[PDB]
Amino acid sequence: SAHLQWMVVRNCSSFLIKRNKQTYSTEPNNLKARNSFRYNGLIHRKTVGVEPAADGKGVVVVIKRRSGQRKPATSYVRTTINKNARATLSSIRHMIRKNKYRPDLRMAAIRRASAILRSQKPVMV
Amino acid sequence: GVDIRHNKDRKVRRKEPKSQDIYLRLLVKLYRFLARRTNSTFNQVVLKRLFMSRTNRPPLSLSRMIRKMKLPGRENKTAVVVGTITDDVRVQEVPKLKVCALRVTSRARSRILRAGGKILTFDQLALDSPKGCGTVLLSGPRKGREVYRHFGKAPGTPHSHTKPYVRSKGRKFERARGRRASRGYKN
Amino acid sequence: RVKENDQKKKEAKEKGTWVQLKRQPAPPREAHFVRTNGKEPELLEPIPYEFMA
Amino acid sequence: NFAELKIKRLRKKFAQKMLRKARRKLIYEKAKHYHKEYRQMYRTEIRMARMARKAGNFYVPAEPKLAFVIRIRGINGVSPKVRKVLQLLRLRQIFNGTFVKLNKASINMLRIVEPYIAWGYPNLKSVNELIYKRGYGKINKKRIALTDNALIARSLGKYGIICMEDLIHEIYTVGKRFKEANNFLWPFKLSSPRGGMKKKTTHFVEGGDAGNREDQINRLIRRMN
Amino acid sequence: KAMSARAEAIKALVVSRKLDRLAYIAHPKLGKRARARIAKGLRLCRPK
RNA sequence: AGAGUGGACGGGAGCGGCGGCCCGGA
RNA sequence: CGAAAGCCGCCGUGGCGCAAUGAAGGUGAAGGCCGGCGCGCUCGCCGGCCGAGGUGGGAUCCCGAGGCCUCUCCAGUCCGC
RNA sequence: GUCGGGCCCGGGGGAGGCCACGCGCGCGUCCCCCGAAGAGGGGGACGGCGGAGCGAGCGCACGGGGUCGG
Ligand SMILES: [Mg+2]
Ligand SMILES: [Mg+2]
Ligand SMILES: [Mg+2]
Ligand SMILES: [Mg+2]
Ligand SMILES: [Mg+2]
Ligand SMILES: [Mg+2]
Ligand SMILES: [Mg+2]
Ligand SMILES: [Mg+2]
Ligand SMILES: [Mg+2]
Ligand SMILES: [Mg+2]
Secondary structure (H helix, E strand, O other), rough: OOOHHHHHOOOOOEEEEOOOEEEOOOOOOOHHHEEOOOOOOOOOOOOOEEOOOOOOOOEEEEEEEOOOOOOOOOOOOEEEEEHHHHHHHHHHHHHHHOOOOOOOOOHHHHHHHHHHHHHHOOOOO | OOOOOOOOOOOOOOOOOOOHHHHHHHHHHHHHHHHHHHHHHHHHHHHHHHOOOOOOOOOHHHHHHHHHHOOOOOEEEEEEEEEEEEEOOOOOOOOEEEEEEEEHHHHHHHHHHHHHOOEEHHHHHHHHHOOOOEEOOOOOOOOOOOOHHOOOOHHHHHHHHOOOOOOOOOOOOOOOOOOOOOOOOOO | OOOHHHHHHHHHHHHHOOOOOOOOOOOOOEEEEOOOOOOOOOOOOOOOOOOOO | OHHHHHHHHHHHHHHHHHHHHHHHHHHHHHHHHHHHHHHHHHHHHHHHHHHHHHHHHHEOOOOOOOEEEEEOOOOOOOOOHHHHHHHOOOOOOOOOOOEOOOOOHHHHHHHHHHOOOEEEOOOHHHHHHHHHOOOOEOOOOEEEEEEOOHHHHHHHHHHHHHHHHHHHHHHOOOOOHHHHHHHHHHHOOOOOOOOOOOOOOOOOOHHOOOEEOOOOHHHHHHHOO | HHHHHHHHHHHHHOOOHHHHHHHHHHHOOOOOOHHHHHHHOOOEEEEE
16 A cells, blocks of 8 residues: 555655755656655556666656556566657656546656756757 | 743643554544544544543443443444453343444454444544544543552542552551551541 | 522513613713802812921 | 536626625725714713803713723733733733723722823724724734734624724724623734833822823823834 | 423414615625615616 | 535426527527 | 574463452452232342443534525425535 | 704705715505595605526726836
8 A cells, every 4th residue: 555655665765865954765766756655656556757768869758557566577667759859748748648647747757858858968068 | 021921831732643653643644634624523532532642542341332332322323432442251242333443352353243243443434434423432441540549649648548559468568557546546 | 689680580571671680890970060059169278387286 | 517607606706796895885884873973972072061161060071981001011020919910901011002991890900000001091093093003803812913804803793893993983982892892902012102201110190101191191102102 | 290281381372774774785694685686776777 | 627605406387698480498 | 693583372380460358267349120919017028121320510422493595486306504 | 052963853945065876667665646535546755675597898006025028
């Protein structure tokens, strides 16, 4: 259960970083990277995360499968998107909203995707 | 400057359980939501009793709850205690009951179930009756224990019946002067 | 005054009025006219000092 | 559903707007009535005294039913009886005035705390300035600025007191609900007296401030609020 | 017997005023039809 | 789109407002 | 690591609790109702049920007269405050 | 006698100020006239009375705590 697992890992977790007045989390499916019940990547039935791609071009969106909830090998389905910026934001927005797959992390995934894209694009002098 | 005393400003009361029990914390969250967003004084009483300590939540006996359900007008109501249902071996037959408790001992639970009743926890109580309707809210005897036998006026005063603090019970342990008129005085 | 209150409430209930039952602490003093009756008020005046005792 | 629902909520909004307009018209008329009553009372007192002078007699007016009291000494070195009377008067700070209703019991406890307060009889202008500028109400044990007739009506509408004009009318013409209105009013926290006091620690009739200045309390209230 | 006696005893039976009108209309339940009348008379036009 | 200071339909029986050659009805 | 951990149950002996009181011999914690009969004697005979008494307060819960509505009326359908 | 009170009790008439007064039709309530019972009718004024949905469209501001498109 999400609430029980949160009451467990709320203060004791290997992803927790408490340093000077701030608290962060480093689990691999954590948009906004904060110690919260909403933005926890392990305790929910449905989770969406975004990362940079394997090569330095594009964004991989990983969502949690419904069925294999106790089998962590097959429990995540990830897709790489190497389009342009407006289409990748529109595609992940369509994915979240039209699947109705946890539609409160939508804008957080949007901010994270735009940050990853802007970091991926080449640096100007 | 204003003339007020500040020694009674902070009210000494529980605002959360002292426990680190996560299941208790979860149902305190649930009943805190219910007491806030509901007009149920039942939910408010259940919340503050959830905050309370273990001595303030004495165990309720099965026979005592049988009597309080047997009281008139309480047919097919849900008996609710926030505390522990213990068994009473002094009662031979058990009627069917719909109880809700934080904790039920093994033999009390077996006796209720094989008598043919239902036992609820507080989450399924909130599913069944979220307002608290059709409930009888009991409690155990909060002043039945040995510390309350020892509290009160001092034992060497009249006319107190306060248990003294003696290291053994016998004819040599605090029965002389002060306890009978043939040794000084009696009071 | 308890028995007086009870009889007063009974008479008020049967006769259909509302009457006062409490008592009130000595109100102020209800504006009024003071007749001089034609004559002028007498002029008072402090006395001189004389030592007797 | 999206047409009957919207016309229903539009009808509800219209009815609430009409109720607001009705209550506004009511409070307007009430204030007009009180203006008539005040001017009638003022001219009535002047006419009574003038009639007694024409007849050759004396007109003794009614000794007032309303007093404004101000705690004017601090909280250091106070007798316990004086302390208890001042906190029954709700004067817990210095320059901390309030309204009292004058009878024998109240006058005797003022006589108890004579050298700590300055008190007197306020006029209608003083009650206007006090309730409008420094008007705070007690709403579930909080001190809330009187900015809203809704606030006044939600606390005191069960006595027919639904506006600040109704409050001022009760306090000035001490009604049957004067206790409730005066207890609704938080005690007024006045400023320091602009211009000074000429001596704090002696009675007003011997050159100080303490005691009963009769209508010079209005001069003090102008300087102090 | 006393309850029967009291039971048979209790069954043995048989201008304008503008400010008051303003309070009546400003009442929330009583003044509903009155301010409805005021509203439709403010916004309706039939001659004569 | 979640919308409730009461909402239900459903025969029951008439209006105000939109569609006339007086017949209406998501 | 582990001098830890696990297990015993015909290993619960024992401790503390479940009963007190008396110096001690010792004794040792449930009532009411309904019927008959003595002498229903301030009370036994048997029988029947019920199960720790009563009063005043008492959080909570239960019933609830009557109210509050819907374009609108006529006869009831549902739940809500 | 009263710039008194009675939502300034009221009614009539003649070359101004004020009002947070202004849909119907029917009912009531009050008043006037013919009144041929002072009946039945011709009218006016008041109402908090009577089954039946809804004005919107721009602004300005002493208006639920500072902005400048200086
Ligand atoms: Mg301070
Ligand atoms: Mg201190
Ligand atoms: Mg001093
Ligand atoms: Mg100066
Ligand atoms: Mg001194
Ligand atoms: Mg071992
Ligand atoms: Mg044992
Ligand atoms: Mg043994
Ligand atoms: Mg006049
Ligand atoms: Mg007139």
